[PDB]
């Protein structure tokens, strides 16, 4: 693997995928034990540790379909990763997505061309692994963590003069981020299991920025849900 | 409503949507009491009855995005229908998909241009109402009905020399049908709840067909699950 | 054939194709003799009878490219049908299309993706069989039935928020319907002969709905023209 | 008119449109009396004369959609030309298309993006003026000139490694040329009457070429038919 | 070669490509010696002569991607031409392109479908031969001829209701013409060397037409630069 | 600037843009004096120092169009950066491309949809600032550093089953990377100067890899050339 400098067995079967390598660090150091950093290439830190005994990895993906695709492919093809769970944030684009909501994406729209490259005239609809999603949902409900299940939009252009998010909101899409289409497509293509869990970093359409206290409570809830999404 | 010859009231808040108006007839007569036909326009029959103190309607949609779009639109816009649940068949495209599996579609791919017409360069991924999906799942588990949750492909062309079934199957898609993309897109667009439940009518790739005994059994399973999808 | 429950030789070489299976019934019972219903699958009635001795069939197609494609393919591949003539209605989109005009389509624009699925970057222009069209034209002129020859638009979305009919009208397109692209494409692909004859059910752009007396006179004229379109 | 150096009046209401300005010269000198050259801009010659008390013009168009679009636009917009009739050659792509057949194009497919640029997700099918087509047909029958009526393909690329000639031929398309789509689109757009009449210059697939004797004969046939297309 | 009536060795290794065959004449007669016309087909004159001893050809291309593609392909495939240099004009679309500027195109945007025909979802960016461009630049600078190096837009529709030139200007595109994409694509595809040199015939966006004195001085400068662009 | 944690002033007018923030670190520490880190957000390090009385900055971009677009946008919009110069690696796709060649990109192709999203039916060709390209060329020649000038391909997918590398190579494209299209598009759009300088990290087709010795040598060459691109 060209972008991960790790050996056999150093990466667990289950990998959390924050976008930010500094969040991978924070997650590993805060939630796991027996932490080893297995990757330093390009500063895209990957870590491996244990949670209640179980080997878990946490790997930064960087931003956008192309960056996450690199890491997901190597993780899957060279380290045989079976469960891939994005933990990151999105801009909410609907009023009924609350700042405290943990979002589970069932599927993801995109303006990436990756699927049209593969399918031409077909619209490929990526799809979360249902078992992972059902576990994550039940984990939230059992504790009373508020959870919303729906779809997201995977954007190529964080800054997009030709954005269609008002239309997307109207069709029921919950928020915008920059990875999920890739995660879900590449995972299912190789018989692996994918899910994205998201918290709300802002409300793109109305203006309202969240507060530090909100984001950090929900981030905690997200990770806790994640740590229970594999049975 | 150009294609439904019914007056408001006559159609329930929850509508089952088989492709075949003769299946709509079957479902109503077999599962409901106090059954009335509210539509004969174009032979596309619809019926209303009760199932245990709940008014339910059953409406033939015809085959294909354009045909289902017509009925769904008019049900939504003219009759204020809130829950819309496709009950139909698909051609299975994966071996791991069994002839007894009731399929619950989370999303669907398509070669229909309906969404590119609306979104251009965006791949829009339609999305089941999770609430309906989860109830249908829990109902199937309660009875021990086997169930598979994943994605389907909505085809414009039952006979397609340029089909990409093999690529879709390699990407995890469970089966082929002709309605789901439109159902989920139109329902979400108007804040309504949609779910597709499908039985296996054949295995597309292996050619292997499914007996009558298996079909009727799974059909029964699908309807009974469907009648349990609204909370 | 999965959607037509008929045996060998039960379907004639020449088939009329109304969209509405109840119009197939009306046509068969009103214009033909020795009528047998050969199909009841999905309520999509097909009939076979004689007109001045000659075996003629009439088969409902349902609405939209996908539905008609199913029936045209089975009719052609399993029953060896040689002449396929759509008889239905359209919404007129030009002022000079009069309520009494029988429209013969030379070709058809579309927002269906079926041809882009097959041809990619090519715009496939479907084309009527000229011999059938010339016969239908001469039949109308010999009696003095008013006839207009031009093109139509084959729409996927009867309800389309992104319709381009004002632009299409300007380019000379006569009306909107939901079948012709399919009929013409599939027919010529298999060396068979296709034509669509259309009457005006309304004027989409200006508002004016026709009258029952108009539609029924012109419908009669359409069928009469059809019954003379095969030499 | 940037590319036609003529003053209003000088160009007839009916214009023949060969690709080759030297053919335009030939046609004028051979078939018309009182012949004047009205344009030398860019060597793209045009001529006006009379044929039996009717003023007719003959204008070279050059090769390809962009070139013909230039001349057609300026003829329509600057000189109020009402009838525009391409007389040219095509590469035959079906065996059933004979070296002696005069081809009358009802419509044309294309890999030109000219219509997608205007219509996006709509496949626009251009359409001959039926009145002209029918007169040309009746004129050919009167003389016993063999004639084929159907569709052609308008190519941007005479030499195309990515050609789809075989698929087009299987779909009934008669031959390849480089003008028709633009002629018919632009003429219909401005309420003008267009027709393309084509001779066979070669058989594209079988490689088999057409003698001079056959070419000149069919050419004669095409011009004589053309001079009979306006009522 | 179907469109060039020339024998072996009659065409030089270096060919200038004006759009206008009458400019090919003017160029050959004005700048070269020992001039022979090798082509008269379709009036698209090609000439061959000497400049300070060196064999140079000048060949009219006609207008648009399809026309120039024909000539470039034949020149390359049948006459083994190695250096192809377009000399023509463009409409300037940016204020800082002055009437006296000789434009050298590094690359070219287009609304032609030729590259999408070949590459589908890929945007192919055509590219000038750097050696030819560097020579042409140095030739201009050594004499003090003002030169601007950037990109152009290769248009299919000289008359385009759907033009995007305001957007293109904003992205830095210098001017509009109708050939360069073709020249550059076809050349590099066959390992040959391409460049387009352009003068400003007008300012498309602001209105200002140049003067005859301007155009003719700059045209001279263009040809002089061209005659030094091959080492 | 959501992703750069710097205050105005801190970032130079000229910025080098490696993909790897650890390369950004290397470049700064090795080539500049008085080095300060101005950004640690997301581990995407940036640095400013001086090289011979000139303030220069070095900013990691991450991998892929979406990631570089983020940093480039914020550098342009929030820090008024005028010169932006990618220094990175590519997979060579032509044998004539040597392991020692420093590549200067004139333009780039892409399978990113970023430009179709903005332009629809137009293929937008991005363009290096010639002034920067020419200085980089002249600097390389001065030292005798081998250099190749041509086009690259910007890929969304490092691992792409549907790659068209062979076709691109046949069309003259020099190598594959993941940034250039966005750099050149965004820089030109805001009147800024962009150039990409690339070293060969591998030969994509022949599989043949490049030693450390060769890599470090060419890397040195690239940086030294880069530091000479602003006049
Ligand atoms: N525009 C945007 N795109 C992607 N992720 C985001 N998070 C917040 N705003 C975003
Ligand atoms: N094999 C098949 N192909 C397409 N649509 C279908 N619906 C059911 N079976 C199908
Ligand atoms: N919008 C429409 N689409 C198709 N057929 C029609 N007939 C009348 N209106 C129509
Ligand atoms: N073979 C051919 N290919 C493309 N255009 C043509 N025009 C005439 N013959 C042709
Ligand atoms: N619109 C245009 N297209 C191409 N070349 C041109 N030269 C001047 N105006 C032009
Ligand atoms: N082989 C390759 N494919 C894609 N992007 C690359 N960047 C560097 N090498 C590459």
Residue numbers in the entry:
A (entry chain A), B (entry chain B), C (entry chain A), D (entry chain B), E (entry chain A), F (entry chain B): 2 to 232
Give sentences copied directly from the paper behind this entry:
Purine nucleoside phosphorylases (PNPs; EC 2.4.2.1) are versatile enzymes that catalyze the reversible phosphorolysis of purine (2′deoxy)ribonucleosides producing bases and (2′deoxy)ribose 1-phosphate. For this purpose, we choose the hexameric PNP (BsPNP233) from the model specie Bacillus subtilis, which displays great biotechnological potential to produce NAs, including the antiviral drug ribavirin. The crystal structure of BsPNP233 confirmed that it is a homohexamer with D3 symmetry as observed for other hexameric PNPs. Analogously to other hexameric PNPs, BsPNP233 is a trimer of dimers where each subunit interacts with the adjacent subunits forming two interfaces: the catalytic, which contains the active site, and the inter-dimeric, involved in hexamer stabilization.
The BsPNP233-Ade binary complex was solved with (BsPNP233-Ade-SO4) or without (BsPNP233-Ade) sulfate ion and represent the first of their kind to be reported for hexameric PNPs. Two subunits were observed in the asymmetric unit of both crystal structures and all of them exhibited clear density for the ligand in the active site. The crystal structures of BsPNP233 in complex with hypoxanthine (Hyp) and adenine (Ade) showed that the purine-binding site consists of residues Cys91, Gly92, Phe159, Val177 and Met179. Hydrophobic interactions are predominant in the stabilization of both ligands. Superposition of BsPNP233-Ade and BsPNP233-Ade-SO4 complexes showed a preferential orientation of Ade in the base-binding site, except in one case where it is rotated by 49° around an axis perpendicular to the base plane. This alternative orientation is not followed by significant conformational changes in the active-site residues; however, it alters the solvation of the active-site pocket. In the alternative orientation, a crystallographic water molecule in the ribose-binding site is absent. This solvent molecule mediates a hydrogen bond between the AdeN9 atom and the carbonyl group of Ser90 in the presence of sulfate ion.
